[PDB]
Nucleic acid binder design. Structure first.
Lengths: 218, 77, 325
RNA sequence: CAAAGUCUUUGGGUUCCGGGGGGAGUAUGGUUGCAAAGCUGAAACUUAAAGGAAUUGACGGAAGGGCACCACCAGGAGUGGAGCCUGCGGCUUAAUUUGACUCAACACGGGAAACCUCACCCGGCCCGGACACGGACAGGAUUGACAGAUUGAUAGCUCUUUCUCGAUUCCGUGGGUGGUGGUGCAUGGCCGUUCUUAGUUGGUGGAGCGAUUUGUCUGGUUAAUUCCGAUAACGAACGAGACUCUGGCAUGCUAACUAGUUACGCGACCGGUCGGCGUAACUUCUUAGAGGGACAAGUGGCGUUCAGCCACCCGAGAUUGAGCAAUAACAGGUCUGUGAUGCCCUUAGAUGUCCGGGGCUGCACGCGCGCUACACUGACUGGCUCAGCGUGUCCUACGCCGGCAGGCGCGGGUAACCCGUUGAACCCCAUUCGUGAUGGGGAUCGGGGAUUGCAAUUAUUCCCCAUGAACGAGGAAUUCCCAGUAAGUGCGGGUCAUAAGCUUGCGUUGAUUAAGUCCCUGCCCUUUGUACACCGCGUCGCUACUACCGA
RNA sequence: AAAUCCUUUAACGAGGAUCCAUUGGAGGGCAAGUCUGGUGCCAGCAGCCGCGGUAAUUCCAGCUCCAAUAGCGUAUAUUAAA
């Protein structure tokens, strides 16, 4: 059973916010796991990218605890990536999943040649720079598939990208930096300004400012 | 391993070994029958077998004849 | 007992090298300073822990091995075996508080006495304090035997071990009767004056530090406590030892003294209180020493990678994690 | 780092220069140099790494901090020295089983074992080898056995003797049970220690690529991540604390013939005394239930007026004592407590089991736990008197008989009833000896006597005579301890057929000294620093094989 | 050219002990066993990391499985990975 804490949460609970897009439009922070689990529902699958065991230096000596990297993805839209460290492995996993649901970003999907059908590729060649790992995504023609290292292959697949030429530089072996780089690249797809978004943005009322009267009752 | 008393006393300086790899050597003989106390490096399994190695030099028999009979043609069984 | 007679010398001596500088010695260092055999010394250590030769320590970060009480003892006997003084073990053992007395036998079959110092701060300091004790005791034992005193004959010293002449008797504390009390008394009184003549005071000259040989001959042992006559309270320690013997013979044997020796004689005897120019053959020697040191330093670094225990701990947890996923 | 920026959204011009570490900036050539040298400059071969930044703090031979009578100081009592009781080694022995070895082994294994226990040693017995299949076997497979020999044994165990026993077997193949057999370094559980010392761990938020950090802290204060309070933290969970038992106090409450008191009547003897006898008043004594009570509350000092500390009045009490006890660990103990157990050994001339006998207890010795002592504040001898925890079908009273160990007979107690008013010992009041190996102290032994039990010879214990020793307060060293506390002194349980010099509890007499410190043996905090470098093992001897130089 | 081979065709030619599929591997990289026996820092394996010193997931075997498949290993030159 879910009982929301945030204003956004309460709105979500009812039917006041229709999609996840109204949150992203006003760049509000999603602080509760349930909001994502409500809108995308069963469409969110996940891949455990890695379980690396680490031994934590304690005054009690050494004890074993596991670091989980999980990339959650609703296909044809939204990715997220989580990293958690815990005593059990299952705990680590679920924590990572929860954490990765809080980090769900939309990706802009573009076209390679003429814009016929549904979008399949990265809209323009973007990059994701994360601590000596430099990931570059490049628009590929339809049906090429994701030509990449296994990890950004996963991440791009769960983003709903069909085809992308990847190229990585630097110490790509350290998984955290690699995955985080690719996530950072994919986030940046919406942040890139093309000629497509040149029209002056007419401002709709924010979820807060629109349903103010309904938030008086709670 | 022995059956007399002075059988054990004869082979006193012979260092024992063991099937499970323990390296020992005899101490006292006790019985009038062949019984012996033996020290070892570690503790023995009961499932074990103690054994000593004795050696002599052996030289071949003098059976030399240069004559050797002509064989019949060889065949299989 | 001592069956193993090759690799056990080199590995245990390598512990003693690390013991003088540091506390618990890591297994990485051992193989570098024991360069004769590489890799297979870690199974020797596992045979050393079977006996009371070495102890393991894995505290928090400190990983390695330290030398034990009995393990330090075996090293001296292994050295005394090479000096041809000790071969087999005699069983008459007087277990004391400061030292242990072990009867030893040589190649000849001639039985001698061996002292092993057991001072019991970490065990590293305790097995260093016993080192200085044997060197000090052997120093006095040599000093008195050369100067006509009735002491055990010094033979050899090894780290904490002292081999002495086998004088077998009973300590004066557990003596019922002496056939001639007067002659024994005068013998003992002479020995206090003898030491004072050489510029020495025993300090603790009691019935607990005197042994009778067939109730004829008084033997003196235990010498780390001795003081100089230059000391301000020189006559006090002199008179306390006199009164200790005066009263004892009056108590146990009922002999009262006719002679009262209080002579200060310093010193009529030895003061024992102090107790193209370079030839090609040299060029060869010098080039050799350079080439050995380059190879020895590289072998140390090869042996320092033995960590084998660190890799074993990391592998166990990874198998548990993958199965649970 | 305002350049080290304007770099995968990569191109303002341009010079030099690096491509894992070594070998090596070495050889060789050239060239410059009077020289020392400089510039230029390899390879063969060897090696999984050389290293740069950052981050926690295992260890400091860091420095500080704080902590503890298993540390000290101020002290009291000892041990260690004697004699003995028992444990360990050591050594003889058929065997003198075994585990345990600094605190964390050594009156420990409820380990005070006559047999049993019992594993050890000697001689013998039994089968307690379930089961499936084959062999045999009913014209009996097999079982039990007097006599006599042998035999310790009325052991048919073997032999003669020839009787019973009716498939209940027996021989083998496998192969199941069983072992106080091996491994505690193959395991569980229980326990010991680190540690009786005090923390451990999330969740969410923040910081960082990340390891990580913040929470968990300047300061004061506390046993303390405790508290006040400061604040990128805010909240938790777990344990300590909050508690369980016990003790202290109630003339208040619920109650009593299986504890009573008071009183009356009766009795006895000089108004008394009686635990001598029965009714009524009731709970003060006694039991035991609820509910109180003390919380640093009151007042005053000192303390960043803060947590608290100190002092005292009221108070019974202004610390009662224990139990239970964390995160993690030691390759701590323990197959010898388990019908809890894995392998391995031994399984029928057994390492299964019973039987008889011994041993575990042996003795030149060291090491330890402990009792009795070394006397005058003492012992002996009378008289006087006072508890509590308990246990009881083996405790026991009461009559008699034997000095005494103990016997005889009758009773009570399956229990607040009987022992038992539990008439305990030091202690108290008189007599004795008097500085001495003494009447202190009783070892070591000779005789008898009585119990226990199938058996007391290796005295099981207990009594009564003798014998009557070392022992003169104990060095070096060390042990324990702060208020009904050390120490004296008995008692009761456990152990036990017979038994406590051990132990676990109980009281009774009852203190001196300190209410502090970090010196000591160690332990605990805090603060700070941190991921075995270099300079000081060789000599000769004959043979072959490798690679250089060479007449 | 003459043949062969292929193609085309009479007859015979298929029940798993056959008309039987191999080579490498099975800790990680890297797809697939904490299986069983043997060995006991030995023999050996292992490109690299490493495995073996008495429970070896890494050796030699057995069984089981995986990758390629009439091919599959190994050494070397070289290209991408760079």
């Amino acid at each position: 059973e879910w009982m929301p804490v945030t204003k956004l949460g309460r709105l979500v609970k009812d039917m006041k916010i229709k999609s996840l897009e109204e949150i992203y439009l006003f760049s509000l922070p999603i602080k509760e796991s349930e909001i994502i689990d409500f809108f995308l529902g069963a469409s969110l699958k996940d891949e455990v990218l890695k379980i690396m065991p680490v031994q934590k230096q304690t005054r009690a000596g050494q004890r074993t605890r596991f670091k989980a990297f999980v990339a959650i993805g609703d296909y044809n839209g939204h990715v997220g990536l989580g990293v958690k460290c815990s005593k059990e492995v299952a705990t680590a996993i679920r924590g990572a999943i929860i954490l990765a649901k809080l980090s769900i970003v939309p990706v802009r999907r573009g076209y390679w040649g003429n814009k016929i059908g549904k979008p399949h590729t990265v809209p323009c060649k973007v990059t994701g720079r994360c601590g000596s790992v430099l990931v570059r995504l490049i628009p590929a023609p339809r049906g090429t598939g994701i030509v990449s290292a296994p990890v950004p292959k996963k991440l791009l697949m769960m983003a709903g990208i069909d085809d992308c030429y990847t190229s990585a530089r630097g110490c790509t072996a350290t998984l955290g930096n690699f995955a985080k780089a690719t996530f950072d690249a994919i986030s940046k797809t919406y942040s890139y300004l093309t000629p497509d978004l040149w029209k002056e943005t007419v401002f709709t009322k924010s979820p807060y400012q629109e349903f103010t009267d309904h938030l008086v009752k709670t | 391993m022995f059956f007399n008393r002075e059988d054990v006393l004869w082979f006193k300086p012979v260092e024992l070994r063991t099937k499970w790899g323990r390296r020992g050597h005899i101490k006292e003989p006790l019985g009038t029958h062949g019984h012996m106390k033996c020290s070892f490096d570690g503790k023995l399994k009961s499932q074990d077998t103690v054994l000593m190695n004795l050696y002599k030099r052996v030289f071949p028999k003098w059976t030399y004849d240069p004559y050797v009979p002509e064989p019949v043609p060889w065949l299989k069984s | 007992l001592r069956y193993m007679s090759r690799d056990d010398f080199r590995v245990l001596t390598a512990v003693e090298m690390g013991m003088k500088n540091h506390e618990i010695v890591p297994g990485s260092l051992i193989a570098s300073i024991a360069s004769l055999k590489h890799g297979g010394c870690n199974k020797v250590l596992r045979e050393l822990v079977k006996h009371k030769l070495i102890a393991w320590e894995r505290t928090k970060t400190v990983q390695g091995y330290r030398l034990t009480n009995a393990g330090y003892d075996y090293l001296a006997l292994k050295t005394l075996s090479s000096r041809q003084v000790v071969e087999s073990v005699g069983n008459q053992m007087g277990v004391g508080k400061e030292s242990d007395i072990y009867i030893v036998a040589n190649e000849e079959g001639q039985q001698f006495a061996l002292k092993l110092h057991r001072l019991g701060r970490h065990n590293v300091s305790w097995l260093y304090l016993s080192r200085l004790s044997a060197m000090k005791e052997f120093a006095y034992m040599k000093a008195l035997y050369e100067r006509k005193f009735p002491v055990p004959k010094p033979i050899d010293y090894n780290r904490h071990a002292v081999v002495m002449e086998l004088i077998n008797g009973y300590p004066l504390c557990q003596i019922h009767h002496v056939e001639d009390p007067a002659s024994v008394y005068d013998e003992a009184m002479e020995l206090i004056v003898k030491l004072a003549n050489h510029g020495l005071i025993h300090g603790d000259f009691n019935e607990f530090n005197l042994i009778l040989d067939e109730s004829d001959h008084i033997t003196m042992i235990d010498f780390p406590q001795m003081v100089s006559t230059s000391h301000p309270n020189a006559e006090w320690y002199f008179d306390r030892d006199v009164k200790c013997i005066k009263d004892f013979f009056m108590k146990r044997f009922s002999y009262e003294s006719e002679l009262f020796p209080t002579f200060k004689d310093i010193r009529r005897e030895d003061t024992l209180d102090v107790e193209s120019t370079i030839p090609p053959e040299l060029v060869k020697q010098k080039v050799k020493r350079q080439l050995t040191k380059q190879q020895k330093s590289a072998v140390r670094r090869r042996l320092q990678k033995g960590a084998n225990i660190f890799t074993k701990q990391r592998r166990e947890n990874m198998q548990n994690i993958k199965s649970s996923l």
